Design an enzyme around this catalytic site. Sequence first.
Site, PDB file in Angstrom:
ATOM      1  N   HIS A 744       0.863  -1.175   0.000  1.00  0.00           N
ATOM      2  CA  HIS A 744       0.000   0.000   0.000  1.00  0.00           C
ATOM      3  C   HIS A 744       0.900   1.225   0.000  1.00  0.00           C
ATOM      4  O   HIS A 744       1.403   1.626   1.062  1.00  0.00           O
ATOM      5  CB  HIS A 744      -0.938   0.010   1.208  1.00  0.00           C
ATOM      6  CG  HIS A 744      -2.061  -0.972   1.098  1.00  0.00           C
ATOM      7  ND1 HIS A 744      -2.122  -2.121   1.855  1.00  0.00           N
ATOM      8  CD2 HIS A 744      -3.156  -0.986   0.303  1.00  0.00           C
ATOM      9  CE1 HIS A 744      -3.213  -2.795   1.540  1.00  0.00           C
ATOM     10  NE2 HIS A 744      -3.859  -2.128   0.599  1.00  0.00           N
ATOM     11  N   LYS A 753     -11.413  -1.433   6.615  1.00  0.00           N
ATOM     12  CA  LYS A 753     -12.288  -2.569   6.352  1.00  0.00           C
ATOM     13  C   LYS A 753     -13.486  -2.645   7.288  1.00  0.00           C
ATOM     14  O   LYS A 753     -14.494  -3.267   6.933  1.00  0.00           O
ATOM     15  CB  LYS A 753     -11.492  -3.875   6.463  1.00  0.00           C
ATOM     16  CG  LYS A 753     -10.140  -3.850   5.758  1.00  0.00           C
ATOM     17  CD  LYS A 753     -10.139  -4.697   4.495  1.00  0.00           C
ATOM     18  CE  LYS A 753      -9.516  -6.063   4.752  1.00  0.00           C
ATOM     19  NZ  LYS A 753      -8.991  -6.705   3.513  1.00  0.00           N
ATOM     20  N   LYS A 770       2.048  -6.432   2.984  1.00  0.00           N
ATOM     21  CA  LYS A 770       1.413  -7.633   3.514  1.00  0.00           C
ATOM     22  C   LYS A 770       2.451  -8.699   3.825  1.00  0.00           C
ATOM     23  O   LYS A 770       3.331  -8.981   3.006  1.00  0.00           O
ATOM     24  CB  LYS A 770       0.396  -8.184   2.516  1.00  0.00           C
ATOM     25  CG  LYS A 770      -0.568  -9.202   3.107  1.00  0.00           C
ATOM     26  CD  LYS A 770      -1.617  -9.616   2.084  1.00  0.00           C
ATOM     27  CE  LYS A 770      -2.907 -10.079   2.744  1.00  0.00           C
ATOM     28  NZ  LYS A 770      -2.733 -11.355   3.493  1.00  0.00           N
ATOM     29  N   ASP A 817     -24.212 -20.234  25.463  1.00  0.00           N
ATOM     30  CA  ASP A 817     -24.895 -21.067  24.483  1.00  0.00           C
ATOM     31  C   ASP A 817     -24.573 -20.591  23.074  1.00  0.00           C
ATOM     32  O   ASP A 817     -24.235 -19.426  22.845  1.00  0.00           O
ATOM     33  CB  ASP A 817     -26.415 -21.076  24.695  1.00  0.00           C
ATOM     34  CG  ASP A 817     -27.091 -22.245  24.001  1.00  0.00           C
ATOM     35  OD1 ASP A 817     -26.383 -23.209  23.637  1.00  0.00           O
ATOM     36  OD2 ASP A 817     -28.325 -22.200  23.816  1.00  0.00           O
ATOM     37  N   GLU A 910     -22.032 -26.330  27.468  1.00  0.00           N
ATOM     38  CA  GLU A 910     -22.640 -27.530  26.912  1.00  0.00           C
ATOM     39  C   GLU A 910     -21.669 -28.703  26.959  1.00  0.00           C
ATOM     40  O   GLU A 910     -20.479 -28.560  26.667  1.00  0.00           O
ATOM     41  CB  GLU A 910     -23.088 -27.305  25.467  1.00  0.00           C
ATOM     42  CG  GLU A 910     -23.785 -28.530  24.876  1.00  0.00           C
ATOM     43  CD  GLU A 910     -24.317 -28.318  23.474  1.00  0.00           C
ATOM     44  OE1 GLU A 910     -25.004 -29.228  22.961  1.00  0.00           O
ATOM     45  OE2 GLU A 910     -24.047 -27.251  22.884  1.00  0.00           O
ATOM     46  N   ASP A1155     -32.447 -17.626  21.869  1.00  0.00           N
ATOM     47  CA  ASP A1155     -31.027 -17.838  22.134  1.00  0.00           C
ATOM     48  C   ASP A1155     -30.684 -17.520  23.584  1.00  0.00           C
ATOM     49  O   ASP A1155     -29.894 -18.233  24.210  1.00  0.00           O
ATOM     50  CB  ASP A1155     -30.186 -16.993  21.179  1.00  0.00           C
ATOM     51  CG  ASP A1155     -30.161 -17.559  19.774  1.00  0.00           C
ATOM     52  OD1 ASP A1155     -30.759 -18.635  19.559  1.00  0.00           O
ATOM     53  OD2 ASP A1155     -29.551 -16.928  18.885  1.00  0.00           O
TER      54      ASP A1155
END
Length: 1202
Positions: A744, A753, A770, A817, A910, A1155
């Site tokens: 860049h 972003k 990058k 959950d 869970e 939920d």
Amino acid sequence: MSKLEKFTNCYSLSKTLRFKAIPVGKTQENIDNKRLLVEDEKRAEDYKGVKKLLDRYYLSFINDVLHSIKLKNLNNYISLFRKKTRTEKENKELENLEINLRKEIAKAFKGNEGYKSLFKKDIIETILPEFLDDKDEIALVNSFNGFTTAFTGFFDNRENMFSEEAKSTSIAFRCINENLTRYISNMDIFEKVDAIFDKHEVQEIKEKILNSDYDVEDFFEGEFFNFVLTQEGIDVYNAIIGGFVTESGEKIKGLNEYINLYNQKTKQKLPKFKPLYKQVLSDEGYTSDEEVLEVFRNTLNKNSEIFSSIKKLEKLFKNFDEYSSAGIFVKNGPAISTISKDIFGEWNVIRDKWNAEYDAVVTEKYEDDRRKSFKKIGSFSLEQLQEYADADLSVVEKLKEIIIQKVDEIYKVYGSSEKLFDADFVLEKSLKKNDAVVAIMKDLLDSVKSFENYIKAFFGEGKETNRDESFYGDFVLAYDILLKVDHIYDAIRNYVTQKPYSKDKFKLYFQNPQFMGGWDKDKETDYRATILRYGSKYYLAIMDKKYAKCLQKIDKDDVNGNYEKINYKLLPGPNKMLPKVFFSKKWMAYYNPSEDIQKIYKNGTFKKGDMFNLNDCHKLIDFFKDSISRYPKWSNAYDFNFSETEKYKDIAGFYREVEEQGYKVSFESASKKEVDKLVEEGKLYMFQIYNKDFSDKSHGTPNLHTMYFKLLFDENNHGQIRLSGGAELFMRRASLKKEELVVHPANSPIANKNPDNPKKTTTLSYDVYKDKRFSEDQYELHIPIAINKCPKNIFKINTEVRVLLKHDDNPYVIGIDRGERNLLYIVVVDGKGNIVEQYSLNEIINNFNGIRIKTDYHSLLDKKEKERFEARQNWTSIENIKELKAGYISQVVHKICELVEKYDAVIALEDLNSGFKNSRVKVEKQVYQKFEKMLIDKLNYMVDKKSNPCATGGALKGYQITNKFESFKSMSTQNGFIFYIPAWLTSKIDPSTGFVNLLKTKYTSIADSKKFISSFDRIMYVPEEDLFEFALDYKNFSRTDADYIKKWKLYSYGNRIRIDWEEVCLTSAYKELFNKYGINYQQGDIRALLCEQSDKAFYSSFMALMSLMLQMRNSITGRTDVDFLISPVKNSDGIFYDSRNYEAQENAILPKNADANGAYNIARKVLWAIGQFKKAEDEKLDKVKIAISNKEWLEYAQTSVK
RNA sequence: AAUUUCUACUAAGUGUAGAUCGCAUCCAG
DNA sequence: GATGCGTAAAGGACG
DNA sequence: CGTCCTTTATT
Ligand SMILES: [Mg+2]
């Protein structure tokens, strides 16, 4: 009184810190001139090669010892092993016999003169060269003389094989625990099935396989087990069972194959022999675009063998009518659901076919057998499936049109990929850059993989009465070729899904086999690596082989700058170290030890046990205490202040002090001028120990590991975190070229972003690249540390968590959950079930200074799922989704850590080994298992970075509220502050009454529907409420045992959402149905009227309307606004639970949606479990069983509400 | 789009937030 | 899914 | 001798 703060300093753990190592000054030039890196990159290659040669001798050594061996207890052991009613005394008897059996094998290894030589220097210098017969390999082993010490790690991995302990690595374990247990099982199967093997059939195997040296019967006698300890003996035993192929190649049938025919042909089910596991030492991915392409062309072009087997299977299935549908079978499993849909258009009508014969009251004990027995079945014939097929419909013919359709899809996709099989083709761009080419290969692989995976169903796992071998001859010949696409598919994907950069690295030794083995000052000359500090910066200093002592001569410079040189002294494993120094030849001569003392040691009376005498052990301690005073290398290094000898309970009590005292870290000044000259001259190599938090430009919160590292040398740290030895230094060669990095460019604005970030664009005065870190060679330094090396707070964590939970008055529970609309959803709950907090974790909120910016990870996943759709379902998009979820849960861990610290709260999770995942949830089971592991891992030493390190909760007083991770299967019951819970009846449940729908409102028959209506106690219209009331006692229906209240009055209150979708007003829809058929619903009890009706369309609309009224969860997919939960049952004050009445509120006392209801109710099952603690005695809290049943749960949910 | 390493970033300008047990070995479908 | 190391100091080989 | 590599001791 805080539950959290009782869990510090409980147990020791090891962690590794990692850093970039940046060369300083002339270090890299000097390293380049001496060609040290090239040496080490080569050494790593040769080191991997020598290990394989070393294996060969180890393997050969094992066969010599295993052949000779003869097991003593064999017949006595097998007998006791076979008893099915053993007194507990006899079970311990078996354990002793089992231990003795493994001890015979181990002692046979270690009793040799040769055993000690294998893991000593000698194996490389002398033993191996004579063994080898190749000049090149002997040269390789010869390259490592004087470098034996670096093999120690490998030697330890091999020493595990010869252990007598019941550990996966052991040879004795594989023989006795696994292979013997299998052998005994095969003896049982053999006597039941002995007769069916034909007189002729056995004599074959003895000549063809056995070579006439032994009889097949011998292999099932207990005393014969010694023959099968070796890999050779295992190969023979497994050959009898599996069948053999001679030097001539003639197929020889195996006993297990014989049994197959028999049980098949007679429609019986006799058992089959297990083959024996291999011995422990008996006997990679694509690396380039050119290799990946080469395989795709070679295995899948139009004259490859895989394409040949497709043309044969097209010819076979084109003649499907020519074969016997009674001898063609479809394996039972998922393929039954699919093929049922394929031809009828319906998944469960083939279910109904077998149900039609098998199908009326259903006790679940009968229902399970009803459900279990159909699962027992192995397969179905095409004839049986045609027995399902309604007349005028041919099952074989429309199966033919489905299979043929799949091969035509392969041929069309071949034509679109045809230029990818030209010999002329060359690759313009790299595959990951080349989306087009990767899409072409994927499309073809998929169309063949799907055809393969679909055709695999025509097996029947038989084990099958007379099979159409004329069909299964051509079919098996072609399918075994086609199956090769499975390996090809996985390898090509794993390559496309890879990262562009490579993490490959090689270890650096600096020509020392024990390089950087430890940090002790005395050993610093031997190891030639140490740690320097200058202000905030830290450095790893490495003395060159020609100048090992160059750092030792340096003295402090008064006038000029000075480095801080580490002075590290450790007494490691005093129980190991103390005797060896004091019973060494060198010190035993110096110090006369009384015969009592060498007795006590040789006798072992100081060691706890029946041999133990307290006085004897006491005497040994005083010996050690006086010798330490006489041994000044220790007494002067550590300010020893031992407890008075009489107080010690055992020898470990004395040792524990020695160990905790035997650690000291300080710093000494060293002239920065003199040291820097050493670096310039090439005598010293210097690297800055670096990560981005040490940057001059860095600001704000550092990495947690940056804190651990700095705390190692902080004087507020007092052995809480020890700097450990065994640090390693690596070189990772660059894997990207700087020119090929995405840039860049500076002074051009970059688009941000994040949608929620107000700032849409950023402009820098410098370039950014990058993956810049992989465009350069990078040293990395791995540093091990030891947390809580000497733990003081010794107790079983779970027992302590149970005691506190019992006596804690207001226990807080954090329920987590997985939701369809919410990645994760959190409910915090007090000791009485009142909701304290409830919110989604869709957005992570990151805090820097006072500023808050959130990241909606649910929107991130949505944008990546849409990106998956576009460009088919590309191989990478799946990976990008996988890693984004993996990085999401690393954010969630911190949010849970705060809540645990905030509310002193126990976590409710869970149990993933029992529950069943709906797959409407975004976070699949594989990602949640990862999460629950990371959770456990963080809670071994839970720390808040922003807390002051010396406070509890800080980096020096981390919380230990969780035991070390073992296995995913171990993530059950309870691990400290974490409780694992079945998800059953946690979402589809009225939180204000505990009501659940246990009725089956599926319409089967007019008669079934009448008995349903009659099973209610009353069905009436309520004019004063404009509602229909359905009074029922659950006792009058089947599969209703779990419910506790039993008597409920249902109401057709409010609306539901039928599933496209439509909104249904229940009361008016009942009136509409009844008016359609002339039922007078105002005339009191209506039950007679509905049953009087004779129209089947009435009972179907009625059962459908019952389904909607009992459908408490209502959702529109794609409409995150609509996820409401509504109850058909009134509470104590005659109110219906409607989740929308609480989603409006900011702080709601009941769940805000479906939920939230799940997380709420997962947490409530821990509350039940805490209720079980408060019932028990403090001593028997260990005994309390946590696992809640559906019966216990419904009783708690329906009584606790009040 | 920079990282000990990973994800999300750009987070106010060579970086931000959270996480991060390395290394070797064996056994499994 | 389990193993094991996260070591200084005795001990010896080689000039 | 020193110096470098090896081997050792385990609640
Ligand atoms: Mg930071």
